[PDB]
Design a protein around this ligand. Structure first.
Ligand SMILES: [Mn+2]
Length: 274
């Protein structure tokens, strides 16, 4: 066991999934730090160094990392792999990114099985000496992710179907909402320029009052202020922060992809009174 295979991912969710497949034969590091905004991140010369010293670079695609393709052009002789191949996208409904794929495919545990398989195939292709370890690790981790779905689905099914409105800041939850039958309301369709402008807040407030939706949420890499404004002006409580674009630090409450899915579903469920 000389030097371990080095994998660099764009952001922390892919880092944790890939590290579960890598196990002990590869080290996986994320370009973006926990808590950093991932959509419009601005890479630095130190990020170039980190990616250039990798043996393999993984990214989400589906219009997540607006910085990645310009960034990757600076990188020489390092293979890359998009980990969303074979996932059917949901389009963004409105705004300047309307009609392109929503990037947040990982919030569906079913979709995470495809992430796992894409990451497995890339590691097997570019580090074939350890294919047996990657294959075995991916099979074990897929087993965990697959069993994750039933308790979550049952938990959210307790909410009456007609009351299943998921009101968040970024429209980051479309794939989770589809899986578990939530209608989707958000202050902005995808992180970008305009986030909490008027008209946006206005429309969400009207839908809240119309349907007496009991709770609204923010997310961990953006400002909580628009969501707290919406809850102050309406009958909805501020349900807290959901995790979607970033894990927490390793000593934080959301250190892993599994903990992110569980925490986000628990917070939603608690926002509705379990
Ligand atoms: Mn996002």
């Amino acid at each position: 066991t000389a030097k371990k295979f080095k994998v660099v991912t764009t952001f922390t969710i892919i880092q944790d999934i890939a590290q579960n497949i890598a196990g002990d034969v590869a080290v996986v590091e994320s370009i973006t730090k926990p808590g950093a905004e991932i959509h419009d991140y601005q890479p630095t010369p130190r990020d170039i160094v980190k990616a250039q010293s990798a043996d393999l670079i993984l990214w989400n695609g589906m219009n997540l990392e607006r910085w990645f393709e310009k960034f990757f052009e600076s990188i020489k002789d390092v293979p890359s792999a998009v980990v969303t191949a074979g996932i059917t996208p949901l389009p963004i409904r409105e705004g300047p990114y309307s009609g392109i794929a929503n990037p947040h495919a990982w919030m569906s545990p079913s979709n995470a099985l495809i992430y796992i398989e894409n990451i497995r195939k890339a590691l097997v292709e570019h580090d074939p000496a350890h294919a047996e370890t990657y294959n075995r690790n991916a099979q074990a981790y897929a087993e965990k992710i697959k069993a994750l779905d039933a308790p979550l689905r049952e938990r959210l099914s307790r909410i009456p179907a007609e009351q299943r409105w998921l009101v968040t800041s970024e429209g980051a939850f479309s794939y989770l909402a589809k899986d578990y039958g939530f209608k989707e309301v958000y202050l902005w369709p995808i992180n970008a320029e305009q986030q909490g402008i008027p008209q946006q807040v206005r429309h969400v407030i009207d839908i809240i009052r119309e349907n007496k939706i009991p709770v609204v949420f923010s997310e961990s890499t953006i400002s909580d202020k628009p969501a707290k404004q919406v809850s102050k002006e309406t009958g909805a409580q501020y349900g807290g922060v959901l995790y979607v674009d970033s894990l927490s630090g390793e000593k934080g409450p959301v250190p892993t992809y599994i903990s992110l899915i569980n925490m986000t579903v628990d917070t939603i469920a608690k926002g509705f009174g379990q």
